[PDB]
């Protein structure tokens, strides 16, 4: 297909226009006074969303060159959506700032390669500076505060997240489901998580998060390897007959053939997914049998004389709801044998003392933890479907932010941390003046998140930024009450991880695009 | 497909215009002098309707941005209907009012999020105040008044419903059926209600409520679980030879596969529905045995030595009509034998004494209620087809409205309640000036229902409002006669639930819409 | 008065607490007060200095403290003598207001084709 | 009339485009081996012309906004050519080179004011370097060469100018008139010169040259600060009988009465001008009397006892022609008591020995030179009237350029100077990146002229330019010969004023455009 080709500043200006369109879409949402975007999910009702990644995904433009600019920047938001969710809007604002300042410096005739190189140097230093700046976040009050802030200053979500994490243990898995009614509810149920996920992306389902989930799924518990569809046909047959979803757990699968089988058979009949078996060897079988009682199944295994040709609708376990991603699976709640589940808990913990050898004790204490910890499930209460989805997305941000906080600690929120590290890096220099100007471009872009936060308030961004820069330590601006003070005392906390991630990804994508000299795209016909 | 993007006031005006188009369509219908709307239908005869849900669900606009506004405000209306089945128009009017006044306040530069927050605070206070204001409804005459006022001041319909519930009891199930002719008819028949809906939306029949209903169905009576459609092929053959639908009552249905395959193989040759067995465990068996006798069928179980393929057309129960919704199935009647009904009544009635223990007597009294009580059925007599549907809609509204008035009592109708509660909340305040202005926006909207009702009269809305405002308690305006007086003496009684429902959903949706800066929609091509 | 629109921004900052009988009047008051800053910020913008920073510094510094666009230095407006006759400021303001009110209330315009 | 109005980049792009069309038209012609430009004349065959002033003059574009861009540079270029006799297209080329990069930088988003400052900064430095580089044009050889360059390598013109300045001195006054048909000639006459202009502007000549000049001027000389100007009425009546102008040289003049009468009643049949005499006191007296004798008249005052009420047409002086402008007066040729004028010249030479005050020693040593052969009159000739006017115009241009040269010395031509100073300033830097680009824009443009000169030759501009920069001093590329060498030894030498003026005006326009925020034009 014939290509259009543009060069130099004619290309770069079109790229920057498209970047701006995307950034303007996303950035309005930033901070406590940022306000929602309506996305026409034209298959249904439009969705109100404040999540910057959800906005970015939809944005894509008619002009092929402006579209190319947009589609590059969307990467930063998507990557930032990984690495614990929160930080997508700040990542996009940073990206825009670096691009804009970089392209000005390129118009001044600087070597864009050296500008990129300088940007990368500054950013690496900033990461280390944040690393040192970070303060551990252990107390429940800090956790709660982080939850509220990521919840868009919603105190209730902070309370629930803190109580849930403190009830299930810092490591326990928490999941969020649509509201049974107007009130949010917290409760705990006998589930477990394990570190294996779906074996093909074609299993991806409704959520854009790269996840698949199943309601009332059957649960296969295979010790065999799936060398070909000849192993699976009896199992698929039984499940298809049962007309209810299936989770395949197997030691190995030639996933390409399975995907072809999925396209042919599972066009519109039954939802099915496959995952790698847990652990290995004895650990594998232990988890397999653990799931079997948790689900009410049996261990399909040739050592028991059972075979996939023999697997009945009851050797297949069952689950009430299951959520799976490309790397991890969680049973939200099993059918299970309650009394037998708890009895096994006692038995496995007993094996901790028998198997006193360090790593067998380790494997046993892992078992009791993944079993007895259960799962806490937050119910997101809201009167309306629109409010349902909106509140749910904010609760999800809270969980991911809180996970990150307990991982990597916290830093002054409101954009203060970035400006602080920026101020500490003022002495940094590169090999040559091009790199030096690149470093300054990066250090200047770091102001952007604060300036945008205040601008959403409709305050004078430069005034506030100047004041904050004139302060020291956690001195910052409270955008929700227009009071300067110690962000920590106000509890305006950001997880170090999210701020780090946003900066790194923005820097990488931004530095690359600055290097563009030419674009080739389909001719607009 | 390329997205259009709009920002700030350019988006909000488009949103508000769409909202106005929908609201103006719907609001005409409000109150006793409110007009009918004529809805185009592809099939043929346009449907005259007064139901605000019916109108809202068709409104859909060509310009993508006003379309987004309309598809959103449609949700409040349908949520209102689902929550209580009545009060859709008042919900919409409120919603539109809130949106209009909120967007005004946003144009004053107030923070949209604080406006939303303020509105929700006012609405929480107003809901609790309505609850305190509410008065229980128990007297048959009050019940009738509610029905008439819901029926568009149709004395006859409210009288009928009052007699019906006083006969069948307030908790028995009442159903509305197409008239035999000009006379309305009420009769009692040995119908049955059990709390299991359609297991798959594939069953959804033609009616716009999205329900599956079958004329003269056979009633499958399998307490055994199915395994796949393969079980039913010879039965489905016999049913095709009869040429009538079949209700598949089964303990479990492979609906994901089985329903799909039933649809694909039948393609309308035979209508088939699948429903869960009533209750669980022994309940399923004893209850299913009961319904068999009432329908004159046999339980397909080893207790009879019967199997799914073995069921003759005569083993299958026979009903004149069966109605299935998303959560409830009711057998309108069974052929059975009235002598057999009485004999069963005696045997189980006696057996109550043998099983007097708390929860056993509970289930047994459930069983007599759901057996002796019978089904009340209202035949909506109307001279012509369009009048048929229009009147049946009104009677359905009356039944929902009346069944809600016994739940939560009644309040001063005609919009008095809202005004009254609004006036009492005048002293409510928020954390800041923006929330204060949001509270005032909410309280001001509360008037809107009365004003619209008055305007439909062509009377002077502000004058009526000020007079009602100046009055106290149930003092109100009688739109049907243009007399001020004690609304309760007149009986213009609104169920508290509808009012509460309308307000909450109105506020919930409207609150989000204030906070919009940006819209993303497919580019108009 | 202190020239360079200092006078206007000064009085505007002093009246910030003013408000009227209803939200509509309040918006009207806020619109008027925002305008009074406009001249200064313009003057600055022409210089290509940061209008917001200058404005905030002037609002901070009491009385005749202001920005001299000829010299790019803050100081006492009077001492340098960038000083407007009060009449000029007053007149400008009132007349400006007049037009504003006039066009707000107008409903109909008539012209040749 | 309803006007198109547009702002910001909408303005920038249109001017840039318009400026570009101009420059590309002109620049090709820059230097001696310029490219031809076929200028259509509707009458007939087009004028193939290598002369860029003519091209530029003739370029006028159809889009109103684009026309702005062209006319701006034209005007500013023209002014450059007025400040000094050369540099129309050089100022143009520079203009383009600055503007283009400036507007690009502005479009990218740098602060327009900061670029302005940075350009201004680099320009000021370059002017200082030019001043240092200048060498005086002391030698008639240099003078001759100067004329050549300003004459498009017309050796003859340079010869004529140099001959004139030898006859009258560098500070003497040369003048040019239509001559003896085929043959050009030079001769000298007893004119006069002094650095005083008109006391009121309304005297301006019929043409818009801004001077006033008078044919057969009568001359009145009085050491009086006349106020009521009552006594002059008989003089006006006598002069109106003669029908010829009168010049009044005074201590002060009541212009609010003379100029009034000169505007109203003297509807063209007579013209008058009024000027201060130079110096003061006994200097002014001696100046007045000597100018009178040259003009064949007498000093007139009540102290003389014979006044404007009595002064005959012969008490007043006379001249064949006189020129007056806002800053200077020159009597072309007094009628004079020629024999008594030389006698007085000798007497004034004696008076050099009679003075003792140095301000009067000055008055004498100047006026003796200013009297002795005070004016030379170039006569232009050609085989046709069209060549006649062509050659006359070029002569005048060369004259002006030569004047500038002796004022401010000369520099290595061919853009050697510019490139030289540009290389010297490469270390300059500004306050911030915006000003830095401004400097780099300015410094890059100074190269442009040279490169253009070379590129018209169709040599490789960059090799040449780099060789020049790698050389030292006046080393440069002689485009008429492709030889490298010392520019001055070739005498391919620009007057410094040309270079300075060209540059500064270039920068000036560039600045205006960079800060141009809005433009208003008819539809
Ligand atoms: N009350 C507050 N005052 C100042 N800044 C805040 C406040 N609440 C949140 N923020 C800041 O706004 C950002 C959080 O808003 P959010 O829309 O979640 O951005 P992101 O999507 O990038 O996480 C963080 O930079 C946080 O520091
Ligand atoms: N006779 C009456 N006088 C005043 N108001 C009335 C009268 N009858 C009904 N109304 C009011 O009209 C509204 C019901 O109109 P309806 O079309 O059913 O709207 P909705 O669909 O919201 O119930 C209620 O507020 C009710 O109180
Ligand atoms: N040197 C200066 N620095 C700052 N402001 C100045 C200076 N000189 C004049 N002004 C201000 O410029 C404004 C008027 O600008 P001007 O272009 O003259 O418009 P106007 O013709 O309406 O006065 C006045 O407020 C005056 O005080
Ligand atoms: N023989 C030559 N070699 C190189 N440069 C020359 C030569 N003759 C003239 N120049 C240069 O040409 C430039 C002037 O070109 P010209 O066409 O006269 O433009 P303008 O008259 O508009 O200034 C001057 O820089 C001058 O030194
Ligand atoms: F970037 Be966010 F907090 F969704
Ligand atoms: K956001
Ligand atoms: K209605
Ligand atoms: K030339
Ligand atoms: Mg967040
Ligand atoms: Mg109703
Ligand atoms: Mg020349």
For residue C47, give the DSSP letter.
Answer: H
Chain B environment of A32 (Cβ under 8 Å): 113
Would you tell me the crossing angle of helices B112-133 and B496-514 to the nearest 10 degrees? 180
Cβ atoms of A184 and A284 closer than 8 Å: no
Q: Residues D31, D37, D40, CA angle at the centre, nearest 5°?
A: 150
Sequence-distant (6+) residues with CB within 8 A of D505 are: D76, D77, D79, D80, D83, D91, D95
Check A36 against B515: CB less than 8 A apart. yes
Pick the CATH number of D191-371 from 3.30.460.20, 1.20.1250.20, 3.40.50.1450, 3.50.7.10: 3.50.7.10
Sequence-distant (6+) residues with CB within 8 A of D380 are: D176, D177, D178, D179, D184, D388, D391, D392, D395
Output b/e per residue, B344-378; b: 16+ Cβ within 10 A. beeebeeeeeeeeeeeeeeebeebeebbebbbbbb
Cβ atoms of B102 and B95 closer than 8 Å: no
Pick the CATH number of B1-134+410-524 from 3.30.70.2190, 3.30.420.40, 1.10.560.10, 1.10.3860.10: 1.10.560.10
Q: Which of A174, A193, A178 is nearest to A334 (CA)?
A: A193
Q: Which of B492, B500, B497 is nearest to B146 (CA)?
A: B492
Token pair belonging to B254: 């492979």
Distance CA A275, CA A220 (A): 10
Domain residue spans in chain A?
A: 1-134+410-524, 135-190+372-409, 191-371
Strand ranges inside D126-180, DSSP E: 173-178
Strands B44-49 and B37-41: antiparallel
Q: Verify whether ligand 1 is closer than 6 Å to residue A29 (CB atom).
A: yes
Say how many Å lie between the first and final Cα of chain A, rounded: 10
User: Which is the closest atom of ligand 1 to the Cα of A29?
Assistant: 17
* Angstrom distances, CA of residue D398 to CA of A138, D153, D181, D208, D403: 88, 11, 21, 21, 9
Sequence-distant (6+) residues with CB within 8 A of B206 are: none
Distance CA A21, CA A99 (A): 13
Question: How remote is the CA of residue B32 from the centroid of ligand 2, in Å?
Answer: 6
Sequence-distant (6+) residues with CB within 8 A of D124 are: none
Strand ranges inside A173-270, DSSP E: 174-178, 185-189, 192-194, 211-215, 218-219, 246-250
Distance (Å) from the alpha carbon of C21 to chain A's nearest alpha carbon: 25
Decide: helix, strand or coil at residue D519.
Answer: strand
- Only one residue has tokens 């002077």, namely B460
Cβ atoms of B6 and B517 closer than 8 Å: no
Distance CA A27, CA A460 (A): 17
Question: Residue A412: CA atoms inside 13 Å, Cβ hemisphere, count?
Answer: 25
Q: Verify whether ligand 2 is closer than 6 Å to residue B453 (CB atom).
A: yes
- Only one residue has tokens 């007579």, namely D270
What does chain A come to in residues?
Answer: 525
Other C-beta atoms within 10 Å of A78: how many?
A: 17
- By the CB < 8 Å criterion, does A241 face chain B? yes
Chain D environment of A100 (Cβ under 8 Å): 109
Q: Is B touching D (3+ C-beta pairs, cut-off 8 A)?
A: no
B residues 83-122 near A, CB within 8 Å? 109, 111-113
Token pair belonging to B399: 């039944």
Cβ atoms of D248 and D258 closer than 8 Å: yes
Q: Which of D216, D203, D196 is nearest to D318 (CA)?
A: D216
Q: Verify whether ligand 4 is closer than 6 Å to residue D89 (CB atom).
A: yes
Q: Residues A184, A189, A195, CA angle at the centre, nearest 5°?
A: 105
What does chain C come to in residues?
Answer: 113
Token pair belonging to D273: 């001008």
Distance CA B400, CA B84 (A): 7
Cβ atoms of D285 and D223 closer than 8 Å: yes
Other C-beta atoms within 10 Å of D201: how many?
A: 12
**Backbone dihedral angles phi then psi of residue A41, each to the nearest 5 degrees:** -70, 70
Sign of CA dihedral D441, D446, D451, D457: positive
Token pair belonging to A100: 């804009």
- By the CB < 8 Å criterion, does C27 face chain B? yes
Decide: helix, strand or coil at residue A54.
Answer: helix
What ligand is nearest to the CA atom of residue B32?
A: 2
Distance CA C44, CA C29 (A): 24
**Backbone dihedral angles phi then psi of residue A371, each to the nearest 5 degrees:** -95, -60
Check C27 against B437: CB less than 8 A apart. no
Q: Which of B20, B99, B18 is nearest to B60 (CA)?
A: B18
For residue D135, give the DSSP letter.
Answer: B
- Only one residue has tokens 């916290």, namely A410
Q: Which of A446, A394, A413 is nearest to A93 (CA)?
A: A446
- Only one residue has tokens 């003022």, namely A426
Token pair belonging to D98: 């600055």
Q: Tell me which CATH homologous superfamily contains domain B135-190+372-409.
A: TCP-1-like chaperonin intermediate domain (3.30.260.10)
Is residue D148 packed enough to be buried (19+ CB in 10 Å), middle (13-18) or exposed (0-12)? buried
Token pair belonging to D178: 């239509």
Token pair belonging to D257: 């009465």
Distance CA B311, CA B234 (A): 9
| DSSP string across D80-94 | HHHHSSS-HHHHHHH
Sequence-distant (6+) residues with CB within 8 A of B451 are: B415, B461, B462, B464, B465
Say how many Å lie between the first and final Cα of chain B, rounded: 9
Is residue C69 packed enough to be buried (19+ CB in 10 Å), middle (13-18) or exposed (0-12)? middle
Question: How remote is the CA of residue D67 from the centroid of ligand 4, in Å?
Answer: 27
Other C-beta atoms within 10 Å of B1: how many?
A: 9
A454, A460, A468, A484: which to substitute to probe chain C, counting the most C Cβ within 10 Å? A460
- Only one residue has tokens 């020629």, namely D338
Alpha helices in B151-281 (DSSP H): 155-168, 233-242, 255-266
Cβ atoms of B134 and B143 closer than 8 Å: no
Q: Whose CA is nearest to atom 4 of ligand 5?
A: A51
Q: Which of B146, B102, B235, B40 is nearest to B487 (CA)?
A: B146
Chain D environment of C48 (Cβ under 8 Å): 111-114
Q: Verify whether ligand 2 is closer than 6 Å to residue B89 (CB atom).
A: yes
Output b/e per residue, A93-124; b: 16+ Cβ within 10 A. bbbbbbbbbbbbbbbbebbbebbbbbbbbbbe
Question: How remote is the CA of residue D134 from the centroid of ligand 5, in Å?
Answer: 66
Chain CA centroid to CA B461, Å: 30
For residue C21, give the DSSP letter.
Answer: S
Q: Which of A64, A154, A127 is nearest to A381 (CA)?
A: A154
Same fold, B1-134+410-524 and B135-190+372-409: no
C16, C27, C30, C31: which to substitute to probe chain B, counting the most B Cβ within 10 Å? C27
Which of A90, A459, A487, A493 has most ligand 1 atoms within 8 Å of its beta carbon, as the pocket-test mutant? A90
Cβ atoms of B111 and A86 closer than 8 Å: no
D104, D433, D443: which to substitute to probe chain A, counting the most A Cβ within 10 Å? D433
What residues of C form the annotated binding site?
A: 4, 68-70, 84
Cβ atoms of A66 and A24 closer than 8 Å: no
Cβ atoms of D247 and D220 closer than 8 Å: yes
Q: Residues A53, A54, A59, CA angle at the centre, nearest 5°?
A: 90
Q: How many CB pairs under 8 A join A and C?
A: 12
Please, which experimental method was used?
A: cryo-EM
Can you count the helices (H) and strands (E) in chain D? 18, 19
Say how many Å lie between the first and final Cα of chain D, rounded: 8
At D73, which helix (H) or strand (E)? helix D64-83
| DSSP string across A15-42 | HHHHHHHHHHHHHTT-STT---EEE--T
What does chain B come to in residues?
Answer: 525
Residue among B71, B75, B257 minimizing CB distance to A240: B257
* Angstrom distances, CA of residue C64 to CA of B37, C51, C54, C93: 68, 18, 14, 19
Distance CA B493, CA B369 (A): 29
Cβ atoms of D39 and D25 closer than 8 Å: no
Distance CA A192, CA A329 (A): 9
Architecture of domain D1-134+410-523: Orthogonal Bundle (1.10)
- By the CB < 8 Å criterion, does B233 face chain A? no
Sequence-distant (6+) residues with CB within 8 A of C54 are: C40, C41, C44, C67
Q: Verify whether ligand 2 is closer than 6 Å to residue B34 (CB atom).
A: yes
Question: How remote is the CA of residue A151 from the centroid of ligand 9, in Å?
Answer: 7
B217 is in an annotated binding site: no
Sequence-distant (6+) residues with CB within 8 A of B97 are: B444, B445, B448
- Only one residue has tokens 């009067």, namely D360
Q: Verify whether ligand 5 is closer than 6 Å to residue A197 (CB atom).
A: no
Distance CA B263, CA D52 (A): 87
Q: Verify whether ligand 5 is closer than 6 Å to residue A318 (CB atom).
A: no
**Backbone dihedral angles phi then psi of residue C10, each to the nearest 5 degrees:** -55, -60
Would you tell me the crossing angle of helices D112-133 and D88-108 to the nearest 10 degrees? 150
Residue among A36, A40, A458 minimizing CB distance to B516: A36
Q: Verify whether ligand 4 is closer than 6 Å to residue D149 (CB atom).
A: yes
Distance CA B55, CA B43 (A): 17
Token pair belonging to A193: 């998580």
Per-residue H/E/C for B12-47: HHHHHHHHHHHHHHHHCCCCCCCCCEEEEECCEEEE
Check C23 against B108: CB less than 8 A apart. yes
Sequence-distant (6+) residues with CB within 8 A of A520 are: A3, A4, A5
At D242, which helix (H) or strand (E)? helix D233-242
Question: How remote is the CA of residue D56 from the centroid of ligand 4, in Å?
Answer: 16
Distance CA B363, CA A490 (A): 57
Distance CA B428, CA B421 (A): 12
At A444, which helix (H) or strand (E)? helix A433-445
For residue B492, give the DSSP letter.
Answer: -
User: Which is the closest atom of ligand 2 to the Cα of B476?
Assistant: 4
Q: Verify whether ligand 4 is closer than 6 Å to residue D476 (CB atom).
A: no
What ligand is nearest to the CA atom of residue B49?
A: 7
Sequence-distant (6+) residues with CB within 8 A of D500 are: D127, D130, D131, D408
- Only one residue has tokens 């209700």, namely B247
Q: Residues D119, D124, D129, CA angle at the centre, nearest 5°?
A: 125
Distance (Å) from the alpha carbon of C88 to chain B's nearest alpha carbon: 31
Strands D328-331 and D47-49: unpaired
């Amino acid at each position: 297909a014939a290509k259009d080709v543009k060069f130099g500043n004619d290309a770069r200006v079109k790229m920057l226009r498209g970047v701006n369109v995307l950034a303007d879409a996303v950035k309005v949402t930033l901070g406590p006074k940022g306000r929602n975007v309506v996305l026409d999910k034209s298959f249904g009702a439009p969705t109100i969303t404040k999540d910057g990644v959800s906005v970015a995904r939809e944005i894509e433009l008619e002009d092929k060159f402006e579209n190319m600019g947009a589609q590059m920047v969307k990467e930063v938001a998507s990557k930032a959506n990984d690495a614990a969710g929160d930080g997508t809007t700040t990542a996009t604002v940073l990206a825009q700032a670096i691009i804009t300042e970089g392209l000005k410096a390129v118009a001044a005739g600087m070597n864009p390669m050296d500008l990129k190189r300088g940007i990368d140097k500054a950013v690496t230093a900033a990461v280390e500076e944040l690393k040192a700046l970070s303060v551990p976040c252990s107390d429940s009050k800090a956790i709660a505060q982080v939850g509220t802030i990521s919840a868009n200053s919603d105190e209730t979500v902070g309370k629930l997240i803190a109580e849930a994490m403190d009830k299930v243990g810092k490591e326990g898995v928490i999941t969020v489901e649509d509201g049974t009614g107007l009130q949010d509810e917290l409760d705990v149920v006998e589930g477990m998580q394990f570190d294996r996920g779906y074996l093909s992306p074609y299993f991806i389902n409704k959520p854009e998060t790269g996840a698949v989930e199943l309601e009332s799924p059957f649960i296969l518990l295979a010790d065999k390897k799936i060398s070909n569809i000849r192993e699976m046909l009896p199992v698929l047959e039984a499940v298809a007959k049962a007309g209810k979803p299936l989770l395949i757990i197997a030691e190995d699968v030639e996933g390409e053939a399975l995907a072809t089988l999925v396209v042919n058979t599972m066009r519109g009949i039954v939802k099915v997914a496959a995952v790698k078996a847990p652990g290995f060897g004895d650990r594998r079988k232990a988890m397999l049998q653990d799931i079997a009682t948790l689900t009410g199944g049996t261990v399909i295994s040739e050592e028991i004389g059972m075979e996939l040709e023999k697997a009945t609708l009851e050797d297949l376990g069952q689950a009430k709801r299951v959520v799976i991603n490309k790397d991890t699976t969680t049973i939200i709640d099993g059918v299970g044998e309650e009394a037998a589940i708890q009895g096994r808990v006692a038995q496995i913990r007993q094996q901790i003392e028998e198997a006193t050898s360090d790593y067998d004790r380790e494997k046993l204490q892992e078992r009791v933890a993944k079993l007895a910890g259960g799962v806490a499930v937050i119910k997101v209460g809201a009167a309306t479907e629109v409010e349902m989805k909106e509140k749910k997305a904010r609760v999800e941000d809270a969980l991911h932010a809180t996970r990150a906080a307990v991982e990597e600690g916290v830093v002054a929120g409101g954009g203060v941390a970035l400006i602080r590290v920026a101020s500490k890096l003022a002495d940094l220099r590169g090999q040559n003046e091009d790199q030096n100007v690149g470093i300054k471009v990066a250090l200047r872009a770091m102001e952007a998140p604060l300036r945008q936060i205040v601008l959403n308030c409709g305050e004078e961004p430069s005034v506030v930024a100047n004041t904050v820069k004139g302060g020291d330590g956690n001195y910052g601006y409270n955008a929700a009450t227009e009071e300067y003070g110690n962000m920590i005392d106000m509890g305006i906390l950001d997880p170090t991880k999210v701020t780090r991630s946003a900066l790194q990804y923005a820097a990488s994508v931004a530095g690359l695009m600055i290097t563009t000299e030419c674009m080739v795209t389909d001719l607009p016909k």
